[PDB]
């Protein structure tokens, strides 16, 4: 059993209401998980406003952006779930603000609020395809220069569609449709028996 | 013009085909008796209006729609097909 300190569960819950009251407009759900973490959920339009309040509020200073990520739930209408994890060196605490974005409904960029996001937002565009308005320079960071397709999308094949080899005839590296010599063995692992939720 | 096959595709329990099935219920036996070799196919489509498909010689198929047509019009159209 982990050493839960209820002292925290309460204080963070109380902040969660605080934020919910301070920004009734964009906060849709707020919950302090049993893992002692707060995850305010905001309408995509509240990206700029909710972050700024957390970066610059005396009772909630959340100066650094730990991470910007986008889970992809294909079932969910709004496919991506942009998640921003923020830290407060002052109150030694953290909060995650997560929004929802669909493939062709872009989110605002927070490079203004935190310049840390300049790179992570480019990372989210390259892997998932979400677009960030007002970004200084959005362009693929991790994928190859000519890569077609957004890789971390759940609908993208792991091996991908193109692989590279050197061809003598043309004396230059050349893409070809992927031909794998041992396909990824897709072990089915889920067990047909569940675990009675505690 | 020999037609090897005559096919009737009567959708079931739908207002439009009522007349089409009425034809079968009343005169199918008659037709078959008369043309005792020709294969008259009674088939049941769905969400489609009835069609009297006819296959003429050398793989040519022809279509006559039976949507909302009376029992004798269906009889007349069938009789027109095997001339």
């Amino acid at each position: 059993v982990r050493p839960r300190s209820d002292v925290t569960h309460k204080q963070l819950s109380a902040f969660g209401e605080y934020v919910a009251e301070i920004l009734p407009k964009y906060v849709q759900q707020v919950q302090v998980s049993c893992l002692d973490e707060l995850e305010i959920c905001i309408h995509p339009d509240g990206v700029i406003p909710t972050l700024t309040f957390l970066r610059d509020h005396t009772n909630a200073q959340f100066k650094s952006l730990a991470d910007l990520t986008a889970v992809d739930v294909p079932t969910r209408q709004n496919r991506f779930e942009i998640v921003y994890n923020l830290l407060s060196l002052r109150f030694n605490s953290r909060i995650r603000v997560k929004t929802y974005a669909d493939e062709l409904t872009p989110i605002d960029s927070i490079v203004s609020v935190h310049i840390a996001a300049n790179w992570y937002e480019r990372e989210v565009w390259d892997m998932f395809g979400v677009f960030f308005f007002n970004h200084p320079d959005l362009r693929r960071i991790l994928t190859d220069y000519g890569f077609e397709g957004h890789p971390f999308r759940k609908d993208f094949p792991l091996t991908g569609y193109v692989e590279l080899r050197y061809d003598d005839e043309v004396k230059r590296v050349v893409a070809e449709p992927v031909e794998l010599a041992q396909e990824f063995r897709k072990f089915d692992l889920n067990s047909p028996w569940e675990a009675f939720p505690a | 013009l020999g037609l090897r096959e005559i096919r009737v595709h009567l959708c079931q329990r739908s207002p439009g085909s009522q007349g089409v099935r009425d034809f079968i219920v009343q005169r199918y036996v008659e037709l078959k008796k008369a043309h005792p070799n020709l294969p008259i196919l009674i088939r049941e489509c769905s969400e489609v209006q009835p069609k009297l498909w006819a296959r003429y010689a050398f793989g040519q198929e022809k279509t006559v729609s039976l949507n909302n047509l009376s029992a004798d019009e269906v009889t007349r159209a069938m009789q027109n097909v095997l001339s």
Binding site: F196 | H9, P39, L41, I42, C45, W53
Partner: protein, 687 residues
Amino acid sequence: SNLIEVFVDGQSVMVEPGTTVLQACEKVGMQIPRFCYHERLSVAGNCRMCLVEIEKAPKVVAACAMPVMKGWNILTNSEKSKKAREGVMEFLLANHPLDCPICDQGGECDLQDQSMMFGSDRSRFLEGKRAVEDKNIGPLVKTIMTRCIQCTRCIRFASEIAGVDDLGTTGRGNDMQVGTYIEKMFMSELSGNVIDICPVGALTSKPYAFTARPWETRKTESIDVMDAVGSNIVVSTRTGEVMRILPRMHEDINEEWISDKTRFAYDGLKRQRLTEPMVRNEKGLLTYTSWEDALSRVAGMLQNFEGNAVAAIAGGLVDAEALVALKDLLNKVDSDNLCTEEIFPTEGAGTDLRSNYLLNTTIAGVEEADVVLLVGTNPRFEAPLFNARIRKSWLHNDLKVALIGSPVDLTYRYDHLGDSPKILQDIASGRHSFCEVLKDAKKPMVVLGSSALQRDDGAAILVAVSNMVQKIRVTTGVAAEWKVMNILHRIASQVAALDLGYKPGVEAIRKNPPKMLFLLGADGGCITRQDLPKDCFIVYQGHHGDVGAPMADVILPGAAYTEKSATYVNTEGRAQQTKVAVTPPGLAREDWKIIRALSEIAGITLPYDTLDQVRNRLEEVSPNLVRYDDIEETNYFQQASELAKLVNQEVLADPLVPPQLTIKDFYMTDSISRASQTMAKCVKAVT
């Protein structure tokens, strides 16, 4: 009314009277852990691994057994019902031999998982274990019964689903071993289901002994083509060869069970299989060659000949799509000489109304019948999962079964009216005694097997049965949607063929011999090359070289139902779709394309060029083909009778006899079956 309100942890799931504790949990959404209880098998209570705790009650109750009462609260995840599982799992595991890396029900174990989820982290059985003695239950089921958790599912299935009543418990104490007292093999169809139903890996499949392990197996859901019940099945393929075929549940057709033939004849699918398109050499011996050359051998002969000169004799196991591609093709050469090997009487309305040739009483209608008149077929060996239907409805409900055939082992108590087709007329006269039984019945059903029709007086046998169905219907005054007359087939591509307007019987080819014949998977002896014209130019279109291959001027290899997205239809017209589990082998190709391609080389190109297009083609010739899983309700029995009355034929005194008299008859029938080493081992075991 009749809605007991009980709380599953407070959910107040209102259930009908007689709902068992477990059933309520299912409805609310939970699933009480369980070893001895199978939905279609009687409750036994042997394991007691399902103990739950109804609220305010001293002891925990047996879920599968207690009928839930009013006001109860089935606390499932309580501190008690977990000590009632943490302590049972202690016992099942205590005498268990830990050879999980031998037990090929490794990931397919309902006892490790339940242990990993409802069991304890460690063992306290510091004492010694027990061992039983492996015996022989047959050539299909490997009983390493030291694994057995004495859950008595087998003894139930072997008595309740199948009527074998052989397997039984022997002895008491911790050496109760559930094996045949004397070593008599468990020989019956429906036999392999024991494997699937034993949650432990005590008895498992001997052919699929150690070829794989379940996490690896990629599972593609497809349709049974060995028999005409069209049982749903899942083909488990690893790295591209089929490793096992196990049932998948279809309430109406095969409800979790499949035949011994259609799960051990996946091995037959892998040998004697045609792959490259050979063509005859100068000396006559067949020689391999590229498609282009083999196809134009056929196309050139096709352009030269026409009309009667060209024919087809479609064999069994040929998909509907291929059928419509072969008819369109032979129709563009002015030939309607398209015939199936199984002769269905076609002198009155046949093939024209779609009820003359279809079980009008859906398989799930055998459950709501009252008297069944089996005439001239052995269901046990012609439709094993329909014999089961009449098995369940004779046990749980009260069907009065009557057979007019050979007195034959039917796994149930039937009434043998006699072995003479004439007796049909007798009942029609009403003179026969059973007339009263039929008269007493309110929802009766006649079933005329296709094999009775395959005799020479089959036209007369169908007409005689239709007369009796007519007055049975009149005397009973049975309601219109209840349908007394139905006929069951034993060839997968017979209802589809008759549907597309293929005319049954090779009688037409017999009267005028075709210069060219394109056998389409036909391994039957319906027409032989001596019978054919001098030219005898015939080209086999199929998957296994059996009877049609060595007498074939061209070999155009095709695929099998594990290897194509084709459609089939069982006996009450439910069209179903096989999915491609494995890509077809060698240069072998899908049946529909070979014929679309031959047509392009010939020049009378068929309209479709992709399979959705061929599905659209099937729609224009027939409805069932495109709508899947959908039985066609209305039929026109009354006009069928009128034409039957016009037809006059004599039923010869020769008794009508099913060809599959005993089970050795059953194991090898079609091509894949014949090519089965497992079926061959089974055949010699019987002999």
